[PDB]
Write an enzyme that holds these catalytic residues in place. Structure first.
Site, PDB file in Angstrom:
ATOM      1  N   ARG B  73       0.907  -1.311   0.006  1.00  0.00           N
ATOM      2  CA  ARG B  73      -0.060   0.088   0.059  1.00  0.00           C
ATOM      3  C   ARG B  73       0.897   1.126   0.041  1.00  0.00           C
ATOM      4  NH1 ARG B  73      -0.579   1.817   4.729  1.00  0.00           N
ATOM      5  NH2 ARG B  73      -1.627   3.890   5.169  1.00  0.00           N
ATOM      6  N   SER B 139       5.825  -6.341   6.949  1.00  0.00           N
ATOM      7  CA  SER B 139       4.928  -7.446   7.774  1.00  0.00           C
ATOM      8  C   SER B 139       4.936  -8.620   7.080  1.00  0.00           C
ATOM      9  CB  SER B 139       3.569  -7.081   8.346  1.00  0.00           C
ATOM     10  OG  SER B 139       2.895  -8.024   9.027  1.00  0.00           O
ATOM     11  N   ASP B 170      11.863   7.562  13.435  1.00  0.00           N
ATOM     12  CA  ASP B 170      10.813   7.746  14.357  1.00  0.00           C
ATOM     13  C   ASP B 170      10.835   8.988  15.017  1.00  0.00           C
ATOM     14  OD1 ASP B 170      11.956   4.755  14.686  1.00  0.00           O
ATOM     15  OD2 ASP B 170       9.758   4.473  14.579  1.00  0.00           O
TER      16      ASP B 170
END
Ligand SMILES: O=C(CO)[C@@H](O)[C@H](O)[C@H](O)COP(=O)(O)O
Ligand code: NA
Lengths: 598, 426
Positions: B73, B139, B170
């Site tokens: 995506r 994942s 992050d």
């Protein structure tokens, strides 16, 4: 630096901008006043001087004083925009159109470099190639210096016709620093006789009124006459002359430096705008600023450059060699500085050699591999390891030019092989902010000239401007290192060359010019003593006194210490033979002149 | 009594000491921002793609990448003004199916297909060369690395260019996420296992980006503060033992003092110091406590949040194999308190140095700015946060600071950015 916004401090003008300063010679042949005593400067001083000469490239003109047109002038910028718009029309019709770059010597090699560069730019957008290169040689002149092939206006016009066969639209860019090369002159002449398909563009750094007005032997016009023809087409937008004054060279005549650098800056900036608009003044200044950034970054490592210079100088002193190993296009730039050591500083081709990753397949020359033409034509890393490596000693200096995006593994192993033969390993490393040199290479290498480049948010074209920055940066370093080393070796009198093999017409007239400035006698007597030295005979006959300059060159091509002998024989009144014996008894060529100077 | 106070006093720092710490931080920031000395600087001050430039780019613009099984995506996030000129953020996406060959094939052909999907969607949205901030969420199925492999994939193509700083970390992701909800947020900070900070620097100050106009998020990487020896008069003997016993002797010194990674190790060394001086546990510790890494960082957090009866404290020390007295547990808590406090005040000095820099660079006598924060030791550790907040406010005189934590339950990095962005769009 008042008109436009700059990011680098350039030297203030500027005695060469005055018409009274050496009016006999055109700008490209004048002596740079900043380097009046370059022959007696330590490594770091030489770096400073040449860094200032290259800084003169980005100088802007003062409109009120009425001098020469500089890089940052309204007319020069406007001309670049006009040519760029013409390049577009060539790119709109990739089938029947073609952009052709042509030059002699360094100009020729640069033409090849920029041709492949913008061919690869189009290839990235899945487009067809539209760029071709033409050089005096031809492709044999990428590895060897063929200065004699410059005085042929016929062979130039023919090769241009041979390349553009079947093309309906051709944009020709002839390069002469210079405005002296008959090869380029003949091509521009051929273009103007076929204006239906050819659009002539001249790139130089002398005013049109300073081009050679001497009739090109075996031809109808002089360079100035052909140029003035293009200038009439220029006012009518039929042709274009791009000639911003850039100033004299650090060592006069050496157009491989400022002339070469400016040519690369001028054309790349011009062509980049064409592909971008595929045109405002804002556009050019954005690109030119990046080249100024390239100048600042390069000479912020002046300490390291000075070390590499002295290292190469010590190597030459111990009868050693400098081996330049470059990765990618930086390899080709390495060759361009190696090939000009033979004619400029009278060096053996073994003294300075360049290699590229990997071979002619990366050079992309139209005549393919040339390795079969001899030993010196083997110019890849594999060829360096196979042939050169098992013979280098401790006195040799091996230089490596790469980026932080190259195969760092094959470079690491290469250092191990070179260390086995010599300790003198120098490295020019480029990097994009902010990638950093691994401790592997950093602890393995002695001293490294590292250059960090700011991030560019310039759309698709940013990546190529990055490459051009690295190429130009490497050139300046190699320009300064090679020229500086031979300067320390004592190959320069003041800021001009005295001893060089007269291999073409321009070198013959230059030799005449050197005689005129060291002595006080006229051009008549200077041509005499020059001819007396070439043919040896004290009293010139009639078969040689009426022989063309092209004949004298063919006779002076196999003579050593031609100009130095003629200088002494005129400086102090004596026979050519006496002048010849006085030089052999002196400790150096330079000393023979200084002693005869008074 | 006084012996344990003299041992734990080495961690104490006065208000004057915090001042030199933040000024020495500012010096390393300036040194890293300059192109000349960026190579040898301990603080790199790395430029990012997060920028507010006149070329159309804005803070919050992001390309989110998410792989899951055989689904890929790409998410385009664009922020800007609407018709009224009010703040607005948009979100677009497109799904892709990874070929079975690419999934089983080497990492090269995986990223080759990934880069192919990226190029395809960027062309469709006409933003292929806009250089947007990048983020990856992986994942895979159950049977420098990621950015390097993607770069190599783009290089193999050659139809566009990406830099090594394209992928945000992050810390930067925290700033963007908090920015979506409070647009005064121009500083990101994570104080977890590691410690890093990012802030909106003037483009003219960033010499590692050829630009003069606008602003850009600068990933400081300030954990390496002190790597060049400018922190040696702040580091104790325990800090040096921790450093030499680590996997990077001499690197990330500042991070090893304020980070939670070696927080438990510092407390452990102090405990052993007291035991050898007969101030703790009768003069003998278990073989477990004398092993490196035995005293976990979570232990420190729990002891500092325990009642006066030392219920949890006794429980932890029991597991370590030591019957502690009430006086022992009191000494252990003070040791945990001492280390965590130093971490809080030094991390405060660093942030204050950034805030004071922005204030001085923006010519404002009152800087209104929000600081986005995240991390285990900031969120979970009790006394840390309050000591932190108090110390900046004390050192940021001339600034009105607001603190907001990241949205819990959305994850880190691109997953966090994507979630908050989608929430602001609806
Ligand atoms: O490099 C040099 C001299 O250093 C020559 O090879 C030039 O390349 C040649 O003279 C070009 O001719 P002009 O550009 O001067 O007309
Ligand atoms: Na900048």
């Amino acid at each position: 630096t008042r008109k436009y916004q700059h990011v680098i401090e350039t030297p203030d003008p500027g005695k060469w901008e005055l018409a009274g300063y050496e009016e006999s010679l055109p700008i490209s042949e004048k002596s740079n006043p900043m380097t009046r005593e370059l022959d007696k400067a330590d490594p770091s001083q030489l770096v400073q001087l040449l860094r200032d000469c290259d800084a003169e490239i980005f100088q802007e003109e003062d409109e009120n004083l009425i001098h020469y047109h500089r890089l940052y002038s309204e007319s020069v910028l406007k001309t670049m925009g006009d040519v760029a718009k013409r390049v577009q029309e060539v790119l709109k019709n990739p089938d029947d159109s073609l952009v052709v770059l042509s030059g002699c010597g360094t100009s020729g090699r640069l033409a090849l470099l920029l041709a492949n560069s913008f061919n690869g730019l189009l290839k990235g957008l899945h487009k067809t190639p539209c760029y071709c290169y033409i050089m005096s040689g031809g492709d044999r002149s990428i590895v060897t210096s063929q200065e004699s092939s410059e005085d042929n206006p016929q062979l130039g016009a023919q090769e241009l016709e041979k390349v553009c066969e079947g093309k309906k639209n051709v944009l020709f860019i002839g390069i002469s620093c210079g405005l002296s090369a008959p090869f380029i002159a003949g091509q521009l002449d051929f273009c103007m006789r076929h204006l239906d398909v050819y659009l002539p563009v001249l790139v130089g750094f002398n005013p049109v009124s300073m081009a050679r007005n001497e009739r090109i032997e075996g031809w109808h016009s002089s360079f100035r006459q052909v140029a003035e023809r293009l200038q009439t087409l220029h006012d009518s937008q039929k042709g274009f002359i791009l000639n911003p004054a850039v100033g004299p060279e650090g060592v006069s005549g050496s157009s491989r430096m400022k002339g070469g650098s400016a040519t690369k800056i001028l054309l790349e900036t011009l062509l980049l705008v064409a592909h971008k608009a595929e045109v405002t003044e804002k556009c050019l200044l954005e690109i030119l600023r990046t080249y100024e950034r390239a100048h600042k970054v390069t000479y912020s490592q002046s300490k390291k450059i000075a070390a590499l210079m002295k290292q190469t100088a010590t190597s030459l002193q111990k009868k050693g060699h400098l081996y330049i190993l470059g990765w990618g296009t930086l390899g080709l730039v390495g060759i361009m500085d190696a090939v000009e050591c033979v004619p400029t500083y009278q060096a053996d081709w073994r003294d300075v050699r360049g290699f590229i990753t990997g071979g002619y397949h990366s050079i992309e020359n139209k005549e393919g591999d040339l390795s079969s033409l001899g030993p010196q034509f083997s110019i890849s890393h594999e060829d360096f390891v196979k042939n050169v490596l098992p013979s280098v000693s401790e006195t040799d200096t091996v230089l490596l030019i790469f980026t932080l995006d190259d195969d760092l593994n094959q470079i690491e192993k290469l250092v191990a092989l070179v260390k086995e033969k010599t300790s003198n390993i120098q490295v020019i490393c480029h990097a994009t902010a902010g990638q950093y040199l691994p401790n592997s290479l950093k602890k393995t290498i002695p001293s490294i000239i590292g250059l960090t480049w700011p991030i560019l948010f310039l759309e698709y074209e940013g990546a190529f401007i990055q490459k051009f920055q690295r190429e130009l940066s490497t050139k300046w370093i190699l320009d300064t290192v090679t020229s500086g080393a031979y300067t320390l070796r004592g190959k320069i009198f003041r800021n001009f060359m005295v001893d060089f093999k007269i291999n073409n017409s321009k070198l013959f007239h230059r030799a005449t010019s050197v005689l005129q400035r060291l002595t006080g006698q006229s051009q008549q007597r200077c041509t005499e003593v020059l001819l007396q030295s070439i043919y040896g005979e004290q009293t010139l006959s009639e078969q040689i006194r009426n022989t063309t300059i092209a004949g004298h060159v063919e006779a002076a091509a196999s003579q050593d210490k031609v100009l130095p002998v003629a200088i002494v024989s005129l400086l102090r009144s004596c026979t050519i033979q006496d002048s010849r014996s006085r030089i052999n008894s002196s400790l150096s060529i330079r000393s023979a002149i200084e002693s005869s100077m008074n | 009594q006084n012996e344990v106070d003299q041992i734990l006093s080495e961690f104490h720092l006065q208000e004057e000491d915090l001042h030199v710490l933040m000024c020495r931080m500012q010096a390393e920031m300036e040194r890293g921002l300059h192109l000349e000395t960026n190579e040898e600087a301990s603080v790199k001050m790395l430029p990012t793609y997060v920028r507010s430039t006149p070329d159309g780019s804005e803070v919050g613009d992001f390309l989110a990448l998410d792989l899951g099984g055989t689904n890929f995506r790409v998410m385009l996030v664009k922020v800007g003004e609407d018709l009224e000129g009010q703040w607005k953020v948009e979100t677009k996406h497109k799904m892709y199916s990874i070929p079975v060959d690419a999934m089983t094939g080497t990492a090269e052909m995986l990223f080759d297909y990934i880069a192919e999907c990226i190029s395809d969607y960027l062309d469709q949205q006409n933003m292929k060369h806009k250089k947007l901030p990048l983020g990856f969420t992986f994942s895979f199925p159950v049977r420098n690395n990621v950015v390097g492999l993607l770069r190599d994939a783009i290089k193999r193509r050659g139809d566009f260019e990406m830099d090594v700083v394209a992928m945000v970390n992050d810390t930067v992701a925290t700033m963007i996420s908090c920015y979506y909800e409070d647009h005064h947020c121009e500083v990101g900070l994570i104080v977890g296992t590691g410690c890093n900070a990012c802030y909106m620097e003037e483009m003219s100050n960033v010499e590692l980006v050829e630009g003069e106009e606008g602003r850009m998020c600068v990933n400081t990487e300030w954990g390496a503060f002190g790597d060049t020896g400018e922190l040696e008069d702040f580091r104790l003997e325990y800090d040096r033992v921790v450093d030499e016993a680590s996997l990077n002797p001499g690197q990330q010194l500042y991070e090893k003092m304020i980070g939670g990674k070696y927080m438990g190790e510092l407390v452990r060394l102090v405990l052993i110091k007291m035991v050898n001086e007969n101030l703790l546990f009768g003069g003998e510790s278990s073989e477990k406590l004398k092993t490196r890494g035995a005293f976990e960082t979570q232990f420190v957090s729990q002891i500092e949040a325990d009642t006066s009866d030392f219920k949890q404290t006794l429980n932890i020390l029991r597991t370590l194999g030591v019957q502690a007295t009430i006086g022992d547990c009191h000494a252990v808590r003070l040791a945990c308190e001492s280390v965590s406090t130093r971490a809080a005040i030094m991390c405060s000095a660093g942030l204050a140095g950034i805030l004071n820099r922005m204030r001085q660079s923006r010519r404002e006598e009152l800087l209104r700015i929000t600081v986005g924060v995240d991390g285990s030791v900031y969120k979970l550790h009790p006394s840390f946060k309050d000591k932190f907040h108090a110390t900046v406010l004390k050192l940021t005189s001339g600034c009105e600071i607001t603190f907001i934590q990241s949205e819990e339950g959305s994850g880190r990095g691109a997953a966090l950015i994507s979630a908050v962005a989608y929430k602001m769009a609806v």
